[PDB]
Amino acid sequence: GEWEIIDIGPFTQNLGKFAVDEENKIGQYGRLTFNKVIRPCMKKTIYENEGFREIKGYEYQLYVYASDKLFRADISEDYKTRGRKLLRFNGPVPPP
Numbered sequence: 001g002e003w004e005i006i007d008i009g010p011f012t013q014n015l016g017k018f019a020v021d022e023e024n025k026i027g028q029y030g031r032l033t034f035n036k037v038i039r040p041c042m043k044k045t046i047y048e049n050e051g052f053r054e055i056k057g058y059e060y061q062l063y064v065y066a067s068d069k070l071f072r073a074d075i076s077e078d079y080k081t082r083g084r085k086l087l088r089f090n091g092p093v094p095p096p
Helices: 010-026
Strands: 001-008 034-047 055-066 069-077 084-090
Touching: 010 034, 010 055, 010 069, 010 084
Parallel strands: none
Antiparallel strands: 001 034, 034 055, 055 069, 069 084
């Protein structure tokens, strides 16, 4: 239950390439080529219990250009394993 904007850099680029790799496995938008992740990129912190410190994981909301179209992708990341999962990939959406 906490939100921050993170600047884009190699870290968000790597998330955007993960999103496009995962969605290509799914195929619901056909074959996609990764171009780049643009601002803004939101990061949500998910705590085990509201009001306590222990971090369960994170969710990142990205705007990702792929095959020259713009999509919104959400990715989860487990705080202990570092495992990631593509939660949603929708689009084209309009530019923010």
